[PDB]
Amino acid sequence: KMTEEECRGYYYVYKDGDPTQMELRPRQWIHNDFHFDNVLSAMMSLFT
Amino acid sequence: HDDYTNQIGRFFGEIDPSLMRHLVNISVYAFNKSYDYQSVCEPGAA
Amino acid sequence: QPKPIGVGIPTINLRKRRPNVQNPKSQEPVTLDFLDAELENDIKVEIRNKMIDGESGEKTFRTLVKSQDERYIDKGNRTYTWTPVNGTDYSSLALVL
Amino acid sequence: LPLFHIALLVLFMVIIYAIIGLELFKGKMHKTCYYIGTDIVATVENEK
Ligand SMILES: *[C@@H]1O[C@H](CO)[C@@H](O[C@@H]2O[C@H](CO)[C@@H](O)[C@H](O)[C@H]2NC(C)=O)[C@H](O)[C@H]1NC(C)=O
Numbered sequence: 625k626m627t628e629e630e631c632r633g634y635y636y637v638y639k640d641g642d643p644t645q646m647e648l649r650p651r652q653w654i655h656n657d658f659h660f661d662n663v664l665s666a667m668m669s670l671f672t
Numbered sequence: 673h674d675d676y677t678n679q680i681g682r683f684f685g686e687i688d689p690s691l692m693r694h695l696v697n698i699s700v701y702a703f704n705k706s707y708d709y710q711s712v713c714e715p716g717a718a
Numbered sequence: 719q720p721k722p723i724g725v726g727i728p729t730i731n732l733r734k735r736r737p738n739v740q741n742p743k744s745q746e747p748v749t750l751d752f753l754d755a756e757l758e759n760d761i762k763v764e765i766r767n768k769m770i771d772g773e774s775g776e777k778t779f780r781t782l783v784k785s786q787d788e789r790y791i792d793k794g795n796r797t798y799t800w801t802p803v804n805g806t807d808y809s810s811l812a813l814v815l
Numbered sequence: 816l817p818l819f820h821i822a823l824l825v826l827f828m829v830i831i832y833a834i835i836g837l838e839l840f841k842g843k844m845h846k847t848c849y850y851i852g853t854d855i856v857a858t859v860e861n862e863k
């Protein structure tokens with residue numbers, strides 16, 4: 625979905641491998657927890 | 673013969689097939705075999 | 719009658735499924751063939767191929783008539799006729815007597 | 816050349832702990848948590 629507004633609502637999570645086991649989860653932005661945003665917040669990630 | 677009266681209404685081929693496989697082979701009685709595409713049955717094995 | 723039609727011996731393994739999803743509803747249509755509703759006969763072929771675009775025609779003949787429960791076959795005289803729909807051509811009718 | 820005795824004790828370090836882990840844990844892992852009667856192994860969304 626690639627951008628802000630349209631990563632919203634519900635989607636399908638297909639289990640194992642096959643498209644007959646659809647589960648329906650919501651979707652949101654996940655922010656990858658060790659991002660490079662601030663110089664302080666980039667010394668965190670570059671410490672690990 | 674009274675072993676047959678417990679069967680009343682069953683098809684004779686499940687009683688004495690050697691007569692009945694013979695009896696179609698000498699005319700009387702013939703048959704047909706059609707297909708019914710909507711009959712529901714049980715699923716098999718894999 | 720409803721219920722979908724079609725395909726062959728339906729293999730399902732229970733060693734693969736999950737305690738989960740309703741196994742979808744198959745948007746397949748119910749398309750019964752004229753040769754697979756009644757018994758196939760070399761006259762009823764000549765009816766259908768005449769009825770599928772034909773303008774008008776009747777034919778009386780001795781056929782095999784499957785009885786309503788598939789036990790039995792009877793033999794009788796069917797006089798049937800047909801005509802197209804004067805408007806659309808997506809159908810054509812047959813009263814059977 | 817001078818490392819040879821250090822490396823040969825690590826080679827004896829592994830063989831002791833391979834035989835002790837072999838006799839203490841043979842066959843102990845083979846249990847599952849499959850679904851009810853199926854072939855699927857049951858996990859939760861990141862669980863190994
Ligand atoms: C259905 O049964 C009819 C019974 O008449 C079969 O028609 C006869 O078939 C035999 C051998 O095929 C012929 O010798 C006869 O001349 C046929 N009679 C008529 C009136 O056609 C018919 O073949 C059967 N159809 C199927 C699919 O089994």
Ligand SMILES: *[C@@H]1O[C@H](CO)[C@@H](O[C@@H]2O[C@H](CO)[C@@H](O)[C@H](O)[C@H]2NC(C)=O)[C@H](O)[C@H]1NC(C)=O
Pocket residue numbers: 804
């Ligand atoms: C639609 O039906 C009408 C009659 O309902 C048909 O009219 C016929 O026309 C033919 C000659 O064109 C006449 O011989 C018939 O007598 C008419 N029928 C009637 C009821 O009088 C008309 O032909 C049909 N449409 C088409 C395209 O065939």
Ligand SMILES: *[C@@H]1O[C@H](CO)[C@@H](O)[C@H](O)[C@H]1NC(C)=O
Pocket residue numbers: 697698
């Ligand atoms: C049964 O009918 C078949 C087909 O006509 C024929 O070949 C066969 O000889 C018949 N059986 C006997 C025992 O005559």
Ligand SMILES: *[C@@H]1O[C@H](CO)[C@@H](O)[C@H](O)[C@H]1NC(C)=O
Pocket residue numbers: 780793794795
């Ligand atoms: C069809 O009609 C004729 C004439 O009325 C009759 O003799 C014949 O028995 C009928 N056909 C059948 C299969 O009964």
